[PDB]
């Protein structure tokens, strides 16, 4: 039995997307951060023709995200955002925004009105390193 | 597809060597510059504790009296490769009564590296920068876990490889002198390091055609550092 | 039964879906059919459409074989890059 | 814990080597066999019942000799039995070459148990799916042992392995006395097999061997018929 | 394909009529959808 | 030399007879003895 | 599917998928072209540079005074194969005192590379080889694929974006035999440039040439040595 | 899961197969060892005691490795057999090389090293056998040693392994006097702790085997007590229990 | 239950080796049937000869193999595995003759083949050969002897046996036959074999569709009957 | 499924599925036929020229195992070359150990064992090519044998391996191969190959002939160009 | 999914089995070691043994050679194997070349031996980390289950690693190691910063220049603990 009703709704969406009774000038946007569970009929490139993949940003992209999310913050002018971007190798844009917010939070805790580089480094440690893995510094001595 | 060194992927890529480059990425930054005057070679130390002896961090090693090397990644694999390089240099000197060319030294190290899967193990997760003078002049070579190797006028490895490489491309020309190469390497290292640059967070090495000796810097580091 | 398109069938499908496009005569549809194993007819049409869109991106006037290969890569969401260990 | 029933070199979380127990189950699913030791010797009997008349009864003998004074019967897989017989004979010959004296029953049982153990200490090799009941005579004393696929060997006074081994053991402890004789042993073993034998005991359906002072000898079908007539 | 359709019919290419945005969570799929809705100039329907 | 050779041949023939359940032939004993002695090049 | 993990597993369709993936590994390398006239065998390879200032990777390898190869695929497999054929040529010159004919060397290469495709333990050699060589039976341009199948080609091209070069060679094949060395090298350069994108052009820093001729040993021309062949080339229409 | 192979470290750094072997040791029969002035003894339960099992070895759990050494056994039967044979081989190799009995501890370490190998190299299951060692030498006199499937060993004065090992070790902790314990007191303690640990009552003698080690005129005689003396030991224990009943 | 049937060394929880049983099932994959009958002074094997093509050289289609001048064999199952076991048996017979002087008994031929099969069964290195071998030979002081060897390594002597697809029916027919005491003459033995095969197959048995191998006390040489002799035996059977 | 990954695994119904997969891999190759005439054997192989860039004779599927033995491989080409090397080594070893040319029946048997040995282990896969061995001698007549990936070998009067095995066998049975010498069997083979070839699917192709017989003194050699052209003309003349 | 084999790199280039090997060290009792101008000292958290257990066999400080000793932290059996191999190698080095083995050389050998067990599948890595102290010049090195060695002026490994090292960095001064008694007192204080029993669970071994090992008896250690308590009694 499964869902059936949900499967029937998905099948009708499939029919509307492509098949008899042409869909027309209806461009369809679909987003999901788990695509491997989708029906192959839905994933077929007659309904979802182009498959745009969003990947973890590179160093330049992460610098751009840092600049975007720190634009409105009251930070110093000497912050090396390339350093912070390199300090978050596998991190999404949301993690970059959280890092910026945590840097602001650190600058607020001790009541400074300017968020310095050390605040951003502490935020990076608190957001990325503090929850990344269990590879401790003695275990991180394996690489030099 | 990403579980053995003998399994090909639908795209044809070996999804195990790329993981070795990823292992490289989390090492430490190493800059190397080859100029007509010689080879300069800088590394961020990444000190972990004041108790730990800084001389134990062997990011720079002497392959021979004329060729030095810089590592990035696993210490064990890097030291194995460095010992292999020293052994090959000594064997070539023994069997030919001449100093091994840095290209040939890199060739031998790469030949060891390619055997990650050959017999009926895993890639050495470490990039090596081999600087040194030979019969043709100063030379700089870079090698990766796959065993591919290439001469580079100025190469950055380890962490911060992308930013250091970009800045190196910006600030490198053909006719640089050794002193200005050292200055450029040091300023790039300062700009790509989270810790404040001083005499204990980095180490320097250099080779010259007629001055193969002094393949290191000891407390003259501050001389270049405070004149930045 | 409707089977997965054969290599010749895939080449024919690409030729049909490239009828309305300004395809260069040098395109080898047999090579494309070899390069798109396990592609249904919808995927071949998507290959042709993606090749046309890429030719638009390249700012060209006619579709090339390399554009078709890039469309093949795009259809399966792959992104070809120059790996350091190949050269 | 079914996930640990495949590897022979992997302890279960309860610390049980499941594959050895499966080999023992294969042993228990074999043809019934009994072995009983009396004050005059040992008797090993087994059910050689074929699937049809077509099978040649005298072609293969289940009760086999190892030395002049050592015999050995089995319960479990058939083909593994021949391998174990060959290894036991080779071990006996090696012991004779080294020491010039026929191998003691206990020593042969120990070496055969070690041989069976060698097949349980590595993956990709299967344990011997057979259990051996070994009779011997040394130093004016009968000896009866049972070697297992696990390599564990004991010193059974009287036992039964194979199908309905519980029934054979239950029949024993009743008709078995430590002060019996070889003839009484033969009778008791035949009766114990009768407790688990389906059909008439044709002289060709039962194989009996005696380990007495004169050595180990497999009974000819005439003697088996005579004993069956004396019993039935 | 909406603002300047003439760039396609001239080349005889029918543009794709669907896009699947997929990737790791937080990579920016919903942000890109929000931007599309921000400068769509057509009817945008956020299906619940 | 002769003692150990004869003992080894006797053990091998005993194993053979046990595997066959038949009386061993003199031809087999002669063959095994001759091959064993020839393998040692007359050093036994 | 589940038959995709081993070169030792046959698919129900009768294919060895690991073999096909080894073939796919060839196109990861840059395009290389080989072609023979009645007197010369010339192979031109497009070199790839990993950095703006790093040297371009060597693409044409020297095997013997009469045999040289271009590699398209894994660097490790290419180097191992090159070492193997260097050793084979050296052994042939040591024993028979005669250069090893190209056909026998290519047959040995196929035999060696077929072993990984049948016995588990080692992946197939993920590299395509363009073998250019002169012997007493005329110049030869063989190609060796990771599936250990070798083709005696009049003119071949392998690697990324090499289909355009193959079309160019098919179109201009009839003229190759009665061509002098310079004309053959210009045809090879045109075939190589056909693979290049619109913005890219064949400069002296990314083209490697290898020529083996009647009275010429296998010589590799790089950087400035490419310029004599590069000059006089007709500019690509645009 | 990280317990499929002996060479797989758990994320917490625990070898699950080794711990599985250690816990599996609990299935083995209870065997106990007590050190005392001028003596050291092992005791063990016969476990399977079926009436149709002839008792022809008399030492199914106690083995004599060297002239002045003996070992108990608790684990897999085959692993125990191979470990004991290899212990004898190591002791005899040492004696042949040095013309001097192996000084107990070294022997333990030797065997332990081998066990460690089975917990490190792949394709080999860890030796699921733990065994006690009693001995005497010219360096530390009477010694008692405890081994583990992991190849870890330790010196002890009174310890037990197998069924109800924790209860036996607690009882030994309660009723052991360091320095002032003799062979007779050690035998009485072993009998009482076996009675308490074995769920069966009255501790029938044929279900328990005791082997002692004593120095006699420089001959380090190793004795295995026959049934007759175990009868009188059991009777002595019963009469002490009856005398202790007098308090009520 | 049936999750333990992917490696020949894995015992099922019921103590069953499923891969060996699968080899036994693969025995029938050849599609043919062979029947062996041991007479009073002769042994006879008859096997189906299915040549479903006018292009095959009927001489080489034979499933009858001469292991040794006095020991003959008939194979059932996959042809490649059967030929491999045939060459192995021939080598074992040659080794026995070289090492012991006298000719190997059929007893030992099947015993050694079964030992090799068992070794393949216990060590997970080679796939068991799914071919059943039936050996016939005049062993002196024992007369004719017929033995059957299976992929499991279980060799057994038989007064009469069969292998292939129609194994149960042929064995049942023989069991009905060998029970009524009769003079098992050579002609009678061939008659019993051909009648078994025809009854279990319901085929008129043209002489080219079967192959007959014969060993006799009078001439202890493995002889394959010519088509004329097969026709003579068939016409004698019909009347 | 499950009983399908290794050649050492028996399916519950009792068949090695890897072997069958190899057989149907051979089935996908171009057709190649072999016909033993009255006094010899002729092999005719169609070869799909995948690219015009290949020279004529490249990827030739006619292999000379010995001075008198020829092969007509069909299937995976690399496996075919390796099996050709194995057969050549077997023939050379037989010559060096016995002093005379190896009989084609015995050579076929040995190479069949070599093929079968690769269908037993999980470490190696079954050979992906099926081939034909043909020979002629004044003491053994003309002999032809066919070996499949399973390793099964027996002599054939005339056969085909590849895509159109059945289609070529229908046109092979209608020849009285026991009578005519191979001089005309050559053009008959060429006609059969041209008929079985699918021009609309396999595009262009090249027909390669070889023969071993009394007309060739007993050595197996490629058919000379004149006879090949005559046979191709005969095949083309049968368009209706 | 990338932690069930030692030769598989994680997608981010991590050898996860090698990292897991360090948890075995993290489960071991704290071992501290410092080097002075004339002495090398090393204390050990000597956890209380059972009442009936003989503590002679329980040894954590083992002397590789007369000029070099070693204290481990991790699995005890792997430690025994490594110590035996180190002793054999030091004797072999003294055999091949006359001069005695340097502490750096023996540490290099131990690190290489540990590494060679992390390069091959079917071979469990050593689960111990070692502190090797010796004279050639007083030198202190620390190994790693990964196979990397380092030179330290002062470490502490095992259960208390971060805490004892944190105490150590702002305690290892030039005057702290000025006197041998001062260095031993520093080791005692560092061990007492983690081992919260005092005296009964402290075992310190001191090797002086061109001298032999001397395990401190539980009366000299008691005297040093009393002196440390008296010195710390200045707070009131
Ligand atoms: N490239 C980027 N630039 C700036 N911000 C970004 C970027 N990528 C992601 N973000 C931030 O990530 C936040 C959350 O991401 P988003 O809502 O797109 O998640 P998602 O990947 O679609 O996940 P889900 O699986 O829940 O659909 C946004 O609010 C935005 O600020
Ligand atoms: Mg979202």
Residue numbers in the entry:
A (entry chain A): 290 to 433
B (entry chain K): 8 to 127, 134 to 241
C (entry chain F): 353 to 439
D (entry chain H): 3 to 234
E (entry chain A): 194 to 241
F (entry chain O): 51 to 94
G (entry chain L): 4 to 241
H (entry chain I): 4 to 251
Paper text:
The ubiquitin-like modifier FAT10 targets hundreds of proteins in the mammalian immune system to the 26S proteasome for degradation. This degradation pathway requires the cofactor NUB1, yet the underlying mechanisms remain unknown. Here, we determined a previously unknown mechanism for substrate delivery to the hs26S proteasome, in which NUB1 functions as an ATP-independent chaperone to trap FAT10 in a partially unfolded state, recruits it to the 19S regulatory particle through Rpn1 binding and presents the FAT10 unstructured N terminus for engagement by the ATPase motor. To determine the structural details of NUB1-mediated FAT10 delivery, we solved the cryo-EM structures of the ATP-hydrolyzing hs26S proteasome either 30 s or 60 s after incubation with the preformed NUB1–FAT10–Eos complex.
Consistent with active degradation, we observed the proteasome in processing states, where FAT10–Eos was engaged by the ATPase motor and partially threaded through the central channel, and in the nonprocessing, engagement-competent state with the NUB1–FAT10–Eos complex bound to the proteasome surface. Nonprocessing and processing conformations were easily distinguished on the basis of the major conformational transitions that occur upon substrate engagement and lead to a coaxial alignment of the N-ring, AAA+ ATPase ring and the 20S core particle. The processing conformations of the NUB1–FAT10–Eos-bound hs26S proteasome at both the 30-s and 60-s time points showed substrate density extending through the N-ring, through the ATPase ring and into the 20S degradation chamber. The length of this substrate trace suggests that, in addition to the unfolded UBL1 domain of FAT10, UBL2 was pulled into the central channel. At the entrance to the N-ring, we observed unresolvable yet more defined globular density that may represent the tough-to-unfold Eos domain of the FAT10–Eos fusion. Interestingly, the NUB1 UBL domain remained bound to Rpn1 at this stage of substrate processing, indicating NUB1 retention at the proteasome after FAT10 unfolding and threading. Outside of the NUB1 UBL domain stably interacting with Rpn1, there appear no other contacts persisting long enough for high-resolution observation by cryo-EM. This is unlike the deubiquitinase Usp14, which uses additional interactions between its catalytic ubiquitin-specific protease (USP) domain and the ATPase ring to enable substrate deubiquitination. Our cryo-EM studies suggested that NUB1 remains bound to Rpn1 after the FAT10 portion of the FAT10–Eos fusion substrate is translocated, although this may also reflect binding of new, potentially uncomplexed NUB1 because of the high concentrations in the sample.
